[PDB]
Design an enzyme around this catalytic site. Structure first.
Site, PDB file in Angstrom:
ATOM      1  N   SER A 187      -3.116   7.095   3.313  1.00  0.00           N
ATOM      2  CA  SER A 187      -1.500   7.494   3.321  1.00  0.00           C
ATOM      3  C   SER A 187      -1.043   8.747   2.576  1.00  0.00           C
ATOM      4  CB  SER A 187      -1.037   5.965   3.175  1.00  0.00           C
ATOM      5  OG  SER A 187      -1.310   6.573   1.407  1.00  0.00           O
ATOM      6  N   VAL A 221       0.753  -1.168  -0.093  1.00  0.00           N
ATOM      7  CA  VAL A 221      -0.217   0.019  -0.091  1.00  0.00           C
ATOM      8  C   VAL A 221       1.214   0.997   0.076  1.00  0.00           C
ATOM      9  CG1 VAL A 221      -1.814   1.339   1.269  1.00  0.00           C
ATOM     10  CG2 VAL A 221      -1.625  -1.273   1.335  1.00  0.00           C
ATOM     11  N   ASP A 275       0.122   5.876   9.568  1.00  0.00           N
ATOM     12  CA  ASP A 275      -0.533   6.968   8.342  1.00  0.00           C
ATOM     13  C   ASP A 275      -2.133   7.209   9.399  1.00  0.00           C
ATOM     14  OD1 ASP A 275      -2.821   4.862   9.511  1.00  0.00           O
ATOM     15  OD2 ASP A 275      -3.057   4.001   6.729  1.00  0.00           O
ATOM     16  N   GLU A 315     -12.929  -2.268   8.818  1.00  0.00           N
ATOM     17  CA  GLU A 315     -11.832  -1.655   9.937  1.00  0.00           C
ATOM     18  C   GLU A 315     -12.748  -0.688  10.358  1.00  0.00           C
ATOM     19  OE1 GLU A 315     -10.705   1.241   6.445  1.00  0.00           O
ATOM     20  OE2 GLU A 315      -9.365   0.829   7.613  1.00  0.00           O
ATOM     21  N   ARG A 354      -7.161   2.956  -3.449  1.00  0.00           N
ATOM     22  CA  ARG A 354      -8.203   3.272  -2.587  1.00  0.00           C
ATOM     23  C   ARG A 354      -8.654   4.227  -2.474  1.00  0.00           C
ATOM     24  NH1 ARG A 354      -6.320   1.625   3.735  1.00  0.00           N
ATOM     25  NH2 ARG A 354      -4.772   3.539   3.595  1.00  0.00           N
ATOM     26  N   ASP A 397      -7.465   1.054  12.101  1.00  0.00           N
ATOM     27  CA  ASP A 397      -8.554   1.822  11.905  1.00  0.00           C
ATOM     28  C   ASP A 397      -9.811   0.739  12.214  1.00  0.00           C
ATOM     29  OD1 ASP A 397      -8.515   2.958   8.631  1.00  0.00           O
ATOM     30  OD2 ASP A 397      -9.349   4.426  10.135  1.00  0.00           O
TER      31      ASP A 397
END
Ligand SMILES: O=C(O)c1ccc2[nH]ccc2c1
Ligand SMILES: [Mg+2]
EC number: 2.3.3.9
Length: 701
Positions: free
Chosen positions: A268, A111, A611, A412, A322, A440
């Site tokens: 991010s 990611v 992040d 999440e 994402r 998260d």
């Protein structure tokens, strides 16, 4: 303004132009129809978007009240208010047109912030990565005496790397007899790999693992092996730095590493306006058109098959994008009222639009014709259903076949977790993964039960019953939904970028837990995490997990309340400093430099790739402790002020100290905490966005 009127929308010119000049050309989509589609989709879905968000608040308020005022009762309650929905009957997802990297291959998933084109390119290119580089360059080979990384090649260290890799080969692609450690050469005869040893030669215990080679069969330049669907390439080059030292002239072992990559527009990255979104969209565009350049995208890899034929292997990580979640709006487009449009809706439209380029020849991504969108931060099946409708409606606007836009469901949020099966069901024909965004998720855990009592410390959370159940429950739901062979069951990010030894030792738990994928923060990490998929037969693990229900609703719902008087003052202090440091360290770069993910040293100086979710946890934890009198507001302030100069020291940078209340970033950090309890679901975006925009504004005048 500098806006373009399209029906009820006023589109930022930079976005309008970007879309017309860069994103639309080559898609055969009529620009006016596209834009009319944007307006229509936005008008149509915005109210439900808002309704969903309101529903989150309503649920949270009721839960808040519930605490302020015992499993069966709590569960009964969650069911009454519609938080806990009925679990649907077993089903199997029907998602189709998905690429092998997702349906079949288990391996690392990288990611990366899409706003960072260098990183994004590196990520796309991280499908293949040097194992020697990953070993030599990280602490996987300890820098013990004599084996430290020097200014130049330490042969002793290089030898450990070599030996490490030989053992990896032995463990992954065993010789019929002997060890790769004693290979003196590789050759191909009768389409068979022949490994020269001192005393004789041997083939592979499983010849089927011989995937191919390059160069002359009788002195190949490389040998390509496959194990658990992942490729390993032994590079042979005696006339190389490392090769010359090697008994078989082996220069490197290249591992297929980041099978897929998630180009991230969400946690991010820091994108708070049209200019930011456009930068993101343009990188995403360049990635899809294959023409992004900082460095360029890798071409496919040519191999000679064992029999002597020719074939090709993907040289690039298969890209997801994402999108942001349902929460945030962005002034990239405002309506006539000046109301910011929902950013998720916009992302669906623009990243989806842009993704079309990746479905066609580049002056390339999904050969099977899918667009892979990770949707984060959804709460429950209606929100999943909403994302699917959004995709459906975008597909129409884009003239795409229905269900082209696949969804990677982040698990999440608690309300998704305890309704995971329903969520998967809502996306039964689009879902290409579920993933436990455990960070998260912890944020949500804390916020949801904010009113229940003080939560355990941040570091404790990772081992709490709720999260372990959540991890298992996620896998179970995916497997029960038939994800095996169809969609990824993914697990979360390894954030300790420098603790690669640690990663290699511990992250193996994820494929062992039946995750066909898990997140790494870098190409290097992807390569090292690839090792795990060679050691663990994820397909088998999943097959073995089939039908298991390893987590109960009660477990999922076990709030991580701290036990009475759990902490000494020094422990509370450290936890506060821990959290303030990570908040400040993350926030200052977010707010000041629009950097959404950074190697931020923590209190113990460990490099964490922070992040936004880490921000959500820390600020929520602090808010929770403050809420319940574990710490005082002065404790918070003191810690922020104490931690600030350190962060200032750990950093083109504007110092926060000593004039904290002049520092937007410092104020952001403070606000994140003091307002934490009031942020919907503890989301940090509203504050980060405001503060970053504020900063940008001051950076102007
Ligand atoms: O979305 C996350 O889980 C996450 C966490 C840390 C990260 N570092 C780089 C990307 C990234 C994503
Ligand atoms: Mg997340």
């Amino acid at each position: 303004t500098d806006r373009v009127s399209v029906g009820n929308l006023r589109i930022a010119r930079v976005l309008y132009d970007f879309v017309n000049n860069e994103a639309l050309p080559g898609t055969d989509i009529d620009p006016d129809s596209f834009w009319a589609g944007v307006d229509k989709v936005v008008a149509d879905l915005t109210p439900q978007n808002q309704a969903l968000l309101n529903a989150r608040d309503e649920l949270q308020a009721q839960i808040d009240k519930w605490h302020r005022r015992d499993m069966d009762a709590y569960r009964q309650f969650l069911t009454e208010i519609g938080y806990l929905l009925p679990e649907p009957d077993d089903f199997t997802i029907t998602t189709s047109g998905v690429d092998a990297e997702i349906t079949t291959t288990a391996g690392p998933q990288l990611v990366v912030p899409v706003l960072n084109a260098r990183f994004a390119l590196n990520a796309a290119n991280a499908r293949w990565g040097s194992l020697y580089d990953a070993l030599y360059g990280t602490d996987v080979i300890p820098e013990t005496d004599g084996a430290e990384k020097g200014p130049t090649y330490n042969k002793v260290r290089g030898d450990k790397v070599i030996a490490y890799a030989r053992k990896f080969l032995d463990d992954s692609v065993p010789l019929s007899s002997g060890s790769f450690g004693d290979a003196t050469g590789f050759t191909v005869q009768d389409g068979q790999l022949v490994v020269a040893l001192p005393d004789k030669s041997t083939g592979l215990a499983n010849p089927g693992q011989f995937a191919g080679y390059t160069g002359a069969a009788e002195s190949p330049t490389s040998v390509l092996l496959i194990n658990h669907g992942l490729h390993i390439e032994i590079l042979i080059d005696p006339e190389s730095q490392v090769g010359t030292t090697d008994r078989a002239g082996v220069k490197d072992v290249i591992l297929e590493s980041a099978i897929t990559t998630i180009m991230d527009f969400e946690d991010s990255v820091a994108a708070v306006d049209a200019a930011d979104k456009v930068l993101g969209y343009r990188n995403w565009l360049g990635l899809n058109k294959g023409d992004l350049a900082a460095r360029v995208l890798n071409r496919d890899r040519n191999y000679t098959a064992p029999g002597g034929g020719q074939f090709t292997l993907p040289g690039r990580s298969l890209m997801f994008v994402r999108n942001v979640g349902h929460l945030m709006t962005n002034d990239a487009i405002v309506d006539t009222d000046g109301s910011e449009v929902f950013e998720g809706i916009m992302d669906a439209l623009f990243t989806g639009l842009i993704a079309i380029h990746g479905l066609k020849a580049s002056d390339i991504n999904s050969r099977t014709g899918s667009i892979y969108i990770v949707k984060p931060k959804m709460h429950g099946p209606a929100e999943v259903a909403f994302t699917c409708e959004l995709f459906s409606r975008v597909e129409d606007v884009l003239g795409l076949p229905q269900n082209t836009m696949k969804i990677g469901i982040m698990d999440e949020e608690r309300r998704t977790t305890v309704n995971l099966k329903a969520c998967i069901k809502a996306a039964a024909d689009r879902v290409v993964f579920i993933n436990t965004g455990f960070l998260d998720r912890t944020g949500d855990e804390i916020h949801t039960s904010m009113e229940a009592g003080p939560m355990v410390r941040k570091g404790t959370m990772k081992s709490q019953p709720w999260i372990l159940a959540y991890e298992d429950h996620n896998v179970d739901a995916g497997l029960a939904a038939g994800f095996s062979g169809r969609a990824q069951v993914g697990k979360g990010m390894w954030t300790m970028t420098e603790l690669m030894a640690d990663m290699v030792e511990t992250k193996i738990a994820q494929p062992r837990a039946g995750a066909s994928t898990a997140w790494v923060p870098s190409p290097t990490a992807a390569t090292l995490h690839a090792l795990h998929y060679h050691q663990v037969d994820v397909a088998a693990v999943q097959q073995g997990l089939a039908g298991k229900r390893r987590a109960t609703i009660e477990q999922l719902l076990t709030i991580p309340l701290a036990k009475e008087l759990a902490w000494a003052p020094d422990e509370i202090r450290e936890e506060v400093d821990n959290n303030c440091q990570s908040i400040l360290g993350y926030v200052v770069r977010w707010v000041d430099q629009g950097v959404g993910a950074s190697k931020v040293p923590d209190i113990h100086d460990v490099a964490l790739m922070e992040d936004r979710a880490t921000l959500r946890i820390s600020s929520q934890l602090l808010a929770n402790w403050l809420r319940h009198g574990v710490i005082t507001s002065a404790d918070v302030r003191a810690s922020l002020e104490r931690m600030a100069p350190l962060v200032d020291r750990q950093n083109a940078y504007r110092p926060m100290a000593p004039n904290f209340d002049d520092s937007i970033a410092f104020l952001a950090a403070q606000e994140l905490i003091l307002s934490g309890a009031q942020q919907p679901n503890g989301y940090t975006e509203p504050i980060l966005h405001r503060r970053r925009r504020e900063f940008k504004a001051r950076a102007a005048e």
